Structures are given as structure tokens and as C-alpha cells.
Amino acid sequence: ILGFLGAAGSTMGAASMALTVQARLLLSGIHMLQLTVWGIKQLQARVLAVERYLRDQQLLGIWGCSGKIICCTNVPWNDSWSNKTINEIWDNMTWMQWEKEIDNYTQHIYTLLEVSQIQQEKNEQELL
Amino acid sequence: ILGFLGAAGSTMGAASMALTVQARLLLSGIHMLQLTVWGIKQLQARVLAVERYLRDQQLLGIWGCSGKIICCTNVPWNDSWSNKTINEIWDNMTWMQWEKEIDNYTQHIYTLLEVSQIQQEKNEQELL
Amino acid sequence: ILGFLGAAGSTMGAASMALTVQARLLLSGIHMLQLTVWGIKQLQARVLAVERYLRDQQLLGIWGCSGKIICCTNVPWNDSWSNKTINEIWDNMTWMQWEKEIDNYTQHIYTLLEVSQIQQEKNEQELL
Amino acid sequence: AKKWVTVYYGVPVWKEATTTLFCASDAKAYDTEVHNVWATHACVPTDPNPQEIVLGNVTENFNMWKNNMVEQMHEDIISLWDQSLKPCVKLTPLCCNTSVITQACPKVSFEPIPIHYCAPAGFAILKCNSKTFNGSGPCTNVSTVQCTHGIRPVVSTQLLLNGSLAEEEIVIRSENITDNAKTIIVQLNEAVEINCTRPNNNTRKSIHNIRQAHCNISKARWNETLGQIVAKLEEQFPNKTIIFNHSSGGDPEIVTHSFNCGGEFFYCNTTPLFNSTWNNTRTDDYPTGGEQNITLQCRIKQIINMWQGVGKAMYAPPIRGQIRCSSNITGLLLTRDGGRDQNGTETFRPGGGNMRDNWRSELYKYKVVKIEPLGIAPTACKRRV
Amino acid sequence: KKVVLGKKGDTVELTCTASQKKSIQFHWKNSNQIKILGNQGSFLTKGPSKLNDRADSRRSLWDQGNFPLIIKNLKIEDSDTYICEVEDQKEEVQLLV
Numbered sequence: 001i002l003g004f005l006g007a008a009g010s011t012m013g014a015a016s017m018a019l020t021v022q023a024r025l026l027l028s029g030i031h032m033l034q035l036t037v038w039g040i041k042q043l044q045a046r047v048l049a050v051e052r053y054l055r056d057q058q059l060l061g062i063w064g065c066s067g068k069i070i071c072c073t074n075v076p077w078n079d080s081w082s083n084k085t086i087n088e089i090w091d092n093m094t095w096m097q098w099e100k101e102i103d104n105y106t107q108h109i110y111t112l113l114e115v116s117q118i119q120q121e122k123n124e125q126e127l128l
Numbered sequence: 129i130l131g132f133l134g135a136a137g138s139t140m141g142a143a144s145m146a147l148t149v150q151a152r153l154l155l156s157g158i159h160m161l162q163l164t165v166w167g168i169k170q171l172q173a174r175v176l177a178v179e180r181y182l183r184d185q186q187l188l189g190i191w192g193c194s195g196k197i198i199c200c201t202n203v204p205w206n207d208s209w210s211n212k213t214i215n216e217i218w219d220n221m222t223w224m225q226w227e228k229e230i231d232n233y234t235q236h237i238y239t240l241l242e243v244s245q246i247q248q249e250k251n252e253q254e255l256l
Numbered sequence: 257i258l259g260f261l262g263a264a265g266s267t268m269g270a271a272s273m274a275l276t277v278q279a280r281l282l283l284s285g286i287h288m289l290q291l292t293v294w295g296i297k298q299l300q301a302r303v304l305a306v307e308r309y310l311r312d313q314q315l316l317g318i319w320g321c322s323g324k325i326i327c328c329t330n331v332p333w334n335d336s337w338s339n340k341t342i343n344e345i346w347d348n349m350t351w352m353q354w355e356k357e358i359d360n361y362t363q364h365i366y367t368l369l370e371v372s373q374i375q376q377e378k379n380e381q382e383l384l
Numbered sequence: 385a386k387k388w389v390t391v392y393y394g395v396p397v398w399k400e401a402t403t404t405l406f407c408a409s410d411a412k413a414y415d416t417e418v419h420n421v422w423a424t425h426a427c428v429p430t431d432p433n434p435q436e437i438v439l440g441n442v443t444e445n446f447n448m449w450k451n452n453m454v455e456q457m458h459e460d461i462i463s464l465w466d467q468s469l470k471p472c473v474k475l476t477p478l479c480c481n482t483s484v485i486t487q488a489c490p491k492v493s494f495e496p497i498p499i500h501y502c503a504p505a506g507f508a509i510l511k512c513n514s515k516t517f518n519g520s521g522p523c524t525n526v527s528t529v530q531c532t533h534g535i536r537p538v539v540s541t542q543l544l545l546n547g548s549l550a551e552e553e554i555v556i557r558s559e560n561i562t563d564n565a566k567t568i569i570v571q572l573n574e575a576v577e578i579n580c581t582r583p584n585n586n587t588r589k590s591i592h593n594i595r596q597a598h599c600n601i602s603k604a605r606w607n608e609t610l611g612q613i614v615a616k617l618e619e620q621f622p623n624k625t626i627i628f629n630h631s632s633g634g635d636p637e638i639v640t641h642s643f644n645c646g647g648e649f650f651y652c653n654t655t656p657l658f659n660s661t662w663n664n665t666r667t668d669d670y671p672t673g674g675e676q677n678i679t680l681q682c683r684i685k686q687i688i689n690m691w692q693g694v695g696k697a698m699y700a701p702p703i704r705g706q707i708r709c710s711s712n713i714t715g716l717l718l719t720r721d722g723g724r725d726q727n728g729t730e731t732f733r734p735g736g737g738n739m740r741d742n743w744r745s746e747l748y749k750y751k752v753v754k755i756e757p758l759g760i761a762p763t764a765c766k767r768r769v
Numbered sequence: 770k771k772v773v774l775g776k777k778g779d780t781v782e783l784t785c786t787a788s789q790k791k792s793i794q795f796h797w798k799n800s801n802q803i804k805i806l807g808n809q810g811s812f813l814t815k816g817p818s819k820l821n822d823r824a825d826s827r828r829s830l831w832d833q834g835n836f837p838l839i840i841k842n843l844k845i846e847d848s849d850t851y852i853c854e855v856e857d858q859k860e861e862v863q864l865l866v
């Protein structure tokens with residue numbers, strides 16, 4: 001389902017815009033072994049893509065992001081991770097470049113996301 | 129996954145009721161080429177049905193309807209599209225008939241749904 | 257997708273903890289008939305698992321639990337169903353044992369969940 | 385604090401369910417043998433790499449007497465037989481006239497192949513791995529598979545053949561030891577070879593023989609086997625002597641041992657195997673005869689009672705050459721007398737069995753269930769409303 | 770219970786029935802629980818009773834849910850209570866000679 005492979009090389013900002021455009025158009029409606037061995041392999045590839053997708057969509061519940069592609073947080077940027085501005089990173093970098101810039105902080109961030117999710121859930125239940 | 133094909137010919141109102149009834153019952157727990165060529169074709173048909181479903185469930189996020197089958201809006205009916213009452217259309221028409229009655233306004237409506245979704249998202253972020 | 261089969265024999269409490277641990281690790285990134293007959297059967301098994309999953313995820317909307325694995329309610333325990341404490345059932349019982357203890361009340365509970373969901377939806381629409 | 389009802393999805397909870405299993409076998413499909421011909425179109429290839437998951441602290445009740453897999457196995461076997469070993473004459477009473485069916489009577493090669501049963505998508509088979517489990521109750525070692533091992537569809541009486549062996553000890557699996565209207569169906573932990581041969585080239589006819597066979601049983605194995613069996617019977621009946629006898633009467637298929645090889649249906653007189661009385665774990669039933677062979681007199685018949693419901697059938701006369709059977713005694717479909725009027729002794733008899741019993745002794749290890757992932761439990765959360 | 774009386778060497782048809790016409794296993798026993806007659810699949814078997822040489826059954830009726838015990842050449846000693854074990858239920862008839 002990774003139709004975003006063709007977005008490689010575009011900037012993070014550009015990739016976001018491209019998806020919005022596509023979303024509107026899609027939503028608006030605008031010799032036998034050579035066949036059967038591969039038939040199975042292609043189905044295996046597609047079934048797996050679906051399974052990984054569903055798995056991740058539920059795993060993300062741990063950060064309060066279940067069922068979403070994009071989810072917003074309650075954890076601020078610490079600026080130790082990176083001190084660039086939003087426009088600098090969204091307009092002058094691709095996703096891969098961005099990931100490399102901060103690939104040594106991902107576990108820190110993941111941990112923070114889990115923690116703030118737990119505290120938020122706790123706060124609601126205490127209030128109720 | 130289109131188990132609603134058998135609903136064709138029923139009214140929009142009737143179709144809704146039928147699903148609710150079914151939902152309760154389901155949820156409550158109440159010669160080789162002839163086999164392998166078709167085996168692959170049936171799997172392809174089913175895998176595709178899943179993929180289109182998941183795609184649409186995420187595309188609908190653009191109208192704030194992600195992950196839903198039925199989603200309610202903040203856009204009123206303009207009555208230029210159709211001036212019939214709710215009971216008239218839900219009880220005396222099938223889905224296909226209804227779609228034909230307004231099939232030249234769908235792009236207008238789709239556009240409005242996108243726009244109100246954008247403004248709502250903006251309002252929340254401005255308030256925060 | 258029932259990766260929880262290996263949880264059989266663990267307590268309900270233990271099963272919950274195990275999933276949280278796994279979720280963090282996964283999310284954080286931490287002779288021809290013998291091949292083709294079974295190739296089709298394995299794909300059929302996996303495609304079906306996906307279809308049942310998606311079906312249930314939408315069926316649960318009737319209780320206001322659509323798209324969720326765990327959903328919390330507005331219906332209290334009646335204690336006629338069972339008078340054990342939370343710790344007693346979560347720590348000294350497996351899911352199967354628990355289900356047996358109350359398997360004659362499931363329809364009662366399912367009915368109550370449907371009803372409270374309807375009333376809640378009604379209340380919101382009346383207020384709006 | 386209100387124990388709010390919470391719905392959890394993905395719960396590993398299951399129920400016994402009825403579905404239809406499919407068969408698989410390692411069919412060859414080119415020797416024009418009955419089982420390979422049938423399997424060619426009836427079954428799929430076996431799974432070359434099946435998986436097994438061992439569950440942890442899981443206890444499951446396995447009731448072998450109510451296992452529906454037995455009925456499904458029964459139906460497939462009848463179809464195999466009706467599609468193969470066609471009698472010249474088949475008589476079916478109908479209520480009460482008699483319907484007679486006549487068919488061509490070719491002889492066919494007939495040698496059983498193991499057949500596996502496999503769960504359809506969405507289902508799984510639980511297996512009991514407890515070597516000391518006698519059935520009708522909690523199995524404390526449960527694993528899950530798609531397919532069972534292969535089972536050879538052997539049709540026989542008194543002594544069941546070519547089945548599986550117990551891991552360590554001989555196991556009594558009676559539904560009720562004390563009912564006296566049910567079988568013992570004891571399986572062995574050791575197979576005992578029985579070699580049955582025709583006196584090839586002995587052609588003699590009666591007038592106003594040919595139909596003969598002889599079965600040789602090692603006496604040593606028989607003696608060891610019975611000593612072990614009586615020890616278990618003594619545990620069930622601690623103050624009594626164990627005595628064995630022949631049948632009290634009934635149809636020939638029960639009175640004598642019945643089996644078949646190729647198109648030949650054999651009847652063997654097992655009297656020499658069951659006239660003992662063990663009490664002090666000793667009988668001297670065999671005088672240390674030093675013969676080392678218990679031999680049975682056997683006959684080959686053309687008119688037999690059908691095992692497939694009530695009816696009778698006739699097959700064509702015997703093959704002119706040599707016929708041999710080589711089988712593993714893997715269990716005994718023993719029964720027991722009333723006992724009400726007995727004093728210090730229990731009497732056992734080998735006569736007995738029908739086909740459902742033969743399959744129960746093989747299928748007791750497997751159960752088919754399905755998971756119902758949606759469950760409910762109370763907890764401490766509340767939904768915001 | 771049902772009571773049936775015969776005389777000397779005549780014959781009696783004692784019966785057991787089922788609502789399920791599937792030739793379901795049944796047995797006949799005397800009052801001392803000694804097996805007399807019963808069904809094992811398609812085959813008829815006998816127990817070690819005094820009646821093995823007298824008892825028979827209408828095999829053709831087994832799939833009709835009818836599982837009789839027919840005793841020929843009655844002996845005065847055969848007077849007893851006969852017990853039907855069919856499926857789970859039991860039925861009784863007393864035989865007098």
C-alpha cells in the first residue's frame with residue numbers, strides 16, 4: 001500500500017501537499033508456473049502489506065494515535081534533538097534526510113510519547 | 129465486502145434498518161487448473177476489496193470522516209440540490225434512485241465538505 | 257492475526273501487560289502440488305482473518321466501540337452476573353475461565369450496551 | 385469503582401464447533417489401487433511443513449465419545465468402500481422387503497494408506513499430548529495444529545490393527561469401567577506382529593481345502609502383553625481373578641477375528657489366544673509349550689455380513705495365488721461380562737467392536753474449536769459522556 | 770412396567786424403541802445385568818446368558834428404531850425382568866412363562 005514510494009526525493013512539505021491533491025481526486029471519483037508461482041507471491045506481498053498496516057494502526061494506540069495516519073501530540077520539541085525551524089526542515093529536506101538528522105533521538109521521543117499518553121489517560125479517569 | 133449488494137431494491141431507510149438488525153446478530157454470535165486458476169482469481173478479488181476499503185477509510189479523513197462508515201457533518205442541505213423532505217427520500221427511494229436525483233451536485237457537495245473540514249480544523253488550532 | 261493464542265493459560269491481567277510490552281517493542285522497531293495447494297489455503301486463511309477483523313471493528317460501532325480493541329462503557333457491573341472483585345478476576349483467572357463464569361449473561365450485557373449507546377447518541381443530538 | 389463493563393477484542397477464548405474437515409494423503413495415483421485412486425480425487429496432498437503451537441497453562445476437556453470427527457471419518461470410509469470393493473450381490477432389507485443389487489465383480493488391489501484430517505480456514509484442532517490421559521476429561525497438555533497425523537482406515541474386529549501405540553504403557557480407555565455395555569478398547573504400547581498366510585499352491589476341493597489361512601502370533605509377545613493387561617485390569621478390580629474367554633455367540637464377524645487383504649475377507653479363530661486365567665499375575669495357560677507360536681485357524685469367506693449398517697453381501701471366490709497379510713496388533717476391543725453373579729472373578733471376552741469404536745481409539749487425541757475474540761470483563765475505567 | 774406372559778416352549782417378542790431411526794446402539798439385559806443381546810454397528814452379538822441359544826432380533830428393523838428381543842423355546846426359568854438399554858433411556862418389561 002506504499003504508494004508513497006514515488007514521493008521519494010520530494011520534500012516533506014511537498015509530500016504532504018501531493019497527498020492532499022490525490023486524496024481529493026481519488027475520493028471525488030476523478031507456461032503455467034510463470035503465472036501461478038508468481039500469482040502466489042504477489043498475493044503474499046499484498047496480504048502482508050495489509051497485515052503490517054493494520055498492526056501499526058493498532059500499535060499506535062499506545063501513543064493515542066490509533067487508527068490514524070497523522071496524529072498530533074502534547075509533547076513539545078526539545079530543540080536538543082534539532083534546532084532548525086519548521087520551514088527549514090519541511091521545505092528544504094526530504095523525509096529520509098530528516099530521519100537521518102534525528103535518527104539517534106527516536107527512542108527518546110518514542111518514550112516521551114508513551115509517557116504523556118499514559119498521564120493523559122490517567123488524568124481523564126481521575127476526573128471522571 | 130459488499131454484502132449490501134442484496135440490499136439493492138430496498139429503500140434507503142430499509143437498508144439502514146437491515147444493517148442494524150444484522151449487526152446485532154453477527155456481533156452477538158447469533159482438473160487442477162479449474163481449482164488453481166480460480167483460486168488465485170478469488171483471492172485477488174478479496175484482497176482488492178480489502179485494499180479499496182482501507183483506502184477509502186483513510187481518504188475520508190479529508191472530510192473529517194476517517195475510519196467511519198457513516199459520518200455526520202456541519203454542512204446543511206442547500207435545497208437547490210433537491211427540495212424533497214427527509215421522509216420522502218428515505219422511505220420512497222432506493223439508494224440508486226437517490227443518487228440519480230442528485231448526481232450532478234456531488235462535486236459541489238464534496239467541495240463544501242472539504243472546506244468546512246478545513247475551517248473546523250483551523251478553528252481548533254487557533255483556539256489552542 | 258490472533259497472536260494472542262500463545263497467551264492462553266495466562267491470567268487476564270498478565271495478558272494485558274504482555275501486550276503493552278510487545279507493543280512498545282514492535283512499534284519502536286525493537287512436488288509442486290505440495291507448494292501450490294497449500295499456498296492457496298494459507299492465503300485463504302490470512303485473508304479471512306483480515307476480513308473478520310474488519311467486520312468486527314465496524315460491528316462494534318453499535319456499542320460505540322468502532323475501530324477499537326478496548327472500549328470503555330457507561331454501563332456499570334450489576335453484580336448479579338458475578339460478585340467477585342476486580343483483582344480477584346483479573347489476577348487469578350484466565351480469559352477462558354472468566355468467560356465460563358459469566359457465559360450465561362452475555363446476551364444481557366450485550367443488550368445493555370446497545371441500549372446505553374442509543375441513549376447517549378440521542379442525548380447528544382437533542383442537545384445540538 | 386463501579387466495575388464498568390469493558391469490552392475487549394482479541395480474547396484467546398474458544399468453543400467446540402462443528403465444521404467439515406478435509407482430507408489429505410500422500411496419494412500416488414498411478415498404481416490403480418483403491419486408496420490411491422480414491423485419494424486422487426478425494427484428498428489433497430499433505431502439508432509439507434505444518435506448524436504446532438504448544439499452549440502453556442491450558443487445560444481442556446476431551447470427550448472421545450462425543451467427538452464428531454468420528455462421524456466424518458466414518459462417512460468418508462464408507463464412500464471409499466462403496467466406490468471400490470463392489471460385491472457381486474448386495475442385499476439391503478427395506479422396511480420389510482429385500483432390495484438386491486448386482487454388480488460386476490472385478491478384484492482390486494486393496495492396501496490402506498494413512499489419511500490426515502485438516503481444519504478449514506478459521507478453525508484449529510486442539511491436540512491432547514498427555515500420555516497418561518485416558519479420555520473423558522481434562523487434558524493438561526494442549527497444543528494446536530491444522531492437521532492430525534495420518535490414520536490408516538483399517539476395518540477389523542476383536543483385535544484392531546496398524547494403529548498408533550501408547551507412549552509408555554497400555555491404556556484402558558473405557559467410557560465406563562463398570563457399565564458392562566461398553567468396550568474397553570485398550571491400546572498397546574507395543575505392537576505385536578501377526579503374520580497371516582495362505583497355504584499357497586494347496587488346492588483341494590470338497591465334494592458333495594482352498595479357503596484356508598494360518599495366523600502366527602509370537603507366544604512370547606502375547607504372554608507379555610496379557611500379563612501387563614491383567615495387571616491393569618486388577619488395578620480396576622483389585623479383589624478379583626482375571627479370566628479370559630471366547631465369545632458367547634453372535635455374527636461370525638464378531639465371534640471370530642475379521643480382517644481383509646486385497647479382496648479377501650478373513651475369519652480367524654482366536655480361541656487359542658483367550659482361555660487364560662491370571663490371578664497371581666500367573667496362568668501357565670501356555671504350558672511353556674516351547675512352540676513359540678500361537679496359531680490360528682482361518683477361513684476365507686465369500687458371503688459376509690456388511691459392517692455398513694444392516695445388510696449382507698457376496699464377493700467373488702478367492703484369488704488362485706498367494707495371499708499374505710502382515711499386521712500390527714495395536715489394541716484389543718475387549719469387553720467384560722455382567723459380573724453380578726460372580727464371586728472373586730471377572731470375565732473378559734475379545735468378541736466385539738464395530739467401526740465407530742475403531743475410530744474413537746484413534747481420534748481421541750483431537751478436538752476442533754474456533755476462537756471467539758470478543759469478550760467482556762468489568763474494570764475501573766469510565767467512558768466520558 | 771409392561772408384563773408379558775407366555776407358556777412352556779412358545780415364543781415371545783419383548784420390545785424396546787427409539788424415536789431416532791438411526792440403528793443406535795442398544796442392549797438387552799436380564800435383572801442381574803447379564804448381557805443377553807445387543808447391537809454393535811451392523812452386527813448382532815450375544816451375551817453369556819441362558820438365552821444365547823434362544824434369543825434373536827429383527828435386524829431389518831434396527832434402522833426403524835425397533836430393537837426387539839425375541840425368545841424362542843421358552844423355559845420356565847426364563848421368567849424374569851428384562852431391561853432395555855436404548856441410547857440413554859431405559860425401559861422394562863417383565864416376562865412370565
Ligand SMILES: *[C@@H]1O[C@H](CO)[C@@H](O[C@@H]2O[C@H](CO)[C@@H](O[C@@H]3O[C@H](CO)[C@@H](O)[C@H](O[C@H]4O[C@H](CO)[C@@H](O)[C@H](O)[C@@H]4O[C@H]4O[C@H](CO)[C@@H](O)[C@H](O)[C@@H]4O)[C@@H]3O)[C@H](O)[C@H]2NC(C)=O)[C@H](O)[C@H]1NC(C)=O
Pocket residue numbers: 492493494495496538540545546643644645646647703704705706707708709710711712
Ligand atoms: C497393516 O500394514 C501393512 C503394511 O504396512 C499391510 O500389509 C500389506 O497388505 C497388502 C495386502 O495385499 C500386501 O500387498 C501385497 O504385496 C505383495 C508384495 O510383492 C504384492 O505382490 C501383492 O500384489 C498381488 O496380490 C494382490 C492381492 O489383492 C493383487 O491385487 C495384485 O494385483 C497382485 O496380484 C498378482 O500376484 C498374485 C500373487 O499370488 C496373483 O495371485 C494375482 O493373480 C496377481 O498375479 C500385494 O501388493 C502388502 O505387501 C502388505 N505389506 C506387507 C509389509 O506385507 C496390512 O494389510 C495392514 N493391515 C491391515 C489389516 O490392513
Ligand SMILES: *[C@@H]1O[C@H](CO)[C@@H](O[C@@H]2O[C@H](CO)[C@@H](O)[C@H](O)[C@H]2NC(C)=O)[C@H](O)[C@H]1NC(C)=O
Pocket residue numbers: 436438439440513514524525526527
Ligand atoms: C506436551 O507434550 C509434548 C509432547 O512430548 C511436549 O513437547 C515436546 O517435548 C519433547 C521432549 O523431547 C520435544 O522433543 C518436542 O519437540 C516437543 N514438541 C513440541 C511441539 O514442542 C510439550 O512440551 C508438552 N507440553 C506441556 C505443556 O507439558
Ligand SMILES: *[C@@H]1O[C@H](CO)[C@@H](O[C@@H]2O[C@H](CO)[C@@H](O)[C@H](O)[C@H]2NC(C)=O)[C@H](O)[C@H]1NC(C)=O
Pocket residue numbers: 560561562563564
Ligand atoms: C458407570 O457404571 C456404574 C455402574 O454400572 C453406574 O452406576 C449405576 O448408576 C445407576 C444410575 O441410576 C444407579 O441406579 C446404579 O445403582 C449404579 N450402580 C451401582 C453399582 O451403584 C454409573 O452411573 C455409570 N456412569 C454413568 C455416567 O452412567
Ligand SMILES: *[C@@H]1O[C@H](CO)[C@@H](O[C@@H]2O[C@H](CO)[C@@H](O)[C@H](O)[C@H]2NC(C)=O)[C@H](O)[C@H]1NC(C)=O
Pocket residue numbers: 579580581598599600675677679
Ligand atoms: C506357524 O507356526 C507353525 C508351528 O508349527 C508352523 O508349522 C510348522 O512349519 C514348518 C515349516 O517347514 C513345518 O516343518 C512344521 O512341521 C510345522 N509344524 C507343524 C506342527 O505342522 C507354521 O508353518 C507357521 N505358519 C507360517 C505361516 O509359517
Ligand SMILES: *[C@@H]1O[C@H](CO)[C@@H](O[C@@H]2O[C@H](CO)[C@@H](O)[C@H](O)[C@H]2NC(C)=O)[C@H](O)[C@H]1NC(C)=O
Pocket residue numbers: 577578579600601602710
Ligand atoms: C512376520 O514376518 C516378518 C517378516 O518376515 C518377521 O520379521 C522378522 O522377525 C525376526 C524376529 O527376530 C527378525 O529377526 C527379522 O529381521 C524380521 N524380518 C524383517 C524383514 O524385519 C516377523 O517376526 C513375523 N512375525 C511373526 C509373528 O512371526
Ligand SMILES: *[C@@H]1O[C@H](CO)[C@@H](O[C@@H]2O[C@H](CO)[C@@H](O)[C@H](O)[C@H]2NC(C)=O)[C@H](O)[C@H]1NC(C)=O
Pocket residue numbers: 639640653654655
Ligand atoms: C476354534 O477352534 C477350537 C479348536 O481349537 C474350537 O473348539 C473346539 O470345539 C469342539 C466342539 O465340540 C470341542 O470338542 C473342542 O474341545 C474345542 N476346542 C477348544 C480348544 O475349545 C472352537 O469352537 C473354534 N471356535 C471358533 C469361533 O471357530
Ligand SMILES: *[C@@H]1O[C@H](CO)[C@@H](O[C@@H]2O[C@H](CO)[C@@H](O)[C@H](O)[C@H]2NC(C)=O)[C@H](O)[C@H]1NC(C)=O
Pocket residue numbers: 627628629630632659660731817
Ligand atoms: C467361557 O464361557 C462359557 C459360557 O458360554 C463357560 O462355559 C460354562 O461353564 C460352566 C461351568 O460349570 C458350565 O456349567 C456351562 O454349561 C458352560 N456353558 C457352556 C455354554 O458351555 C466356560 O467355562 C468359560 N470358559 C472360561 C475359560 O471361562
Ligand SMILES: *[C@@H]1O[C@H](CO)[C@@H](O[C@@H]2O[C@H](CO)[C@@H](O)[C@H](O)[C@H]2NC(C)=O)[C@H](O)[C@H]1NC(C)=O
Pocket residue numbers: 603655656657658659660661668669670671672673674675676677678679
Ligand atoms: C488355550 O488354547 C491353546 C490352544 O487352543 C492351548 O495351547 C496349546 O496346548 C497344547 C496342548 O498340548 C500345546 O501342545 C500347545 O503348544 C499349546 N500352545 C502353545 C502356543 O503353547 C492352551 O493351553 C489353552 N490354555 C488354557 C489355559 O486352556
Ligand SMILES: *[C@@H]1O[C@H](CO)[C@@H](O[C@@H]2O[C@H](CO)[C@@H](O)[C@H](O)[C@H]2NC(C)=O)[C@H](O)[C@H]1NC(C)=O
Pocket residue numbers: 579600675676677
Ligand atoms: C513361528 O511362526 C513363524 C512364521 O513365520 C516361523 O517363521 C518361519 O520359520 C520357518 C522355518 O523353516 C522359516 O522357513 C520361515 O522363513 C519363517 N518365517 C519367516 C517370516 O521368517 C517361526 O520359526 C515360528 N517359530 C518357531 C519357534 O518355529
Ligand SMILES: *[C@@H]1O[C@H](CO)[C@@H](O)[C@H](O)[C@H]1NC(C)=O
Pocket residue numbers: 517518519520521522523558559560561
Ligand atoms: C480416566 O478414566 C476414568 C474412568 O472413569 C475417568 O473417570 C477419569 O476422569 C479419566 N481421566 C481423566 C483425566 O478424566
Ligand SMILES: *[C@@H]1O[C@H](CO)[C@@H](O)[C@H](O)[C@H]1NC(C)=O
Pocket residue numbers: 607608611665666667668669670
Ligand atoms: C509369561 O512369561 C513369564 C516370564 O517369566 C512367565 O513367568 C509366565 O508364567 C508366563 N505366562 C503366564 C501366563 O504366567
Ligand SMILES: *[C@@H]1O[C@H](CO)[C@@H](O)[C@H](O)[C@H]1NC(C)=O
Pocket residue numbers: 546575710711712
Ligand atoms: C509395526 O510397528 C513397527 C514399529 O516400528 C513398524 O516398523 C512396522 O512396520 C509396523 N507394522 C505394520 C504392519 O505397520
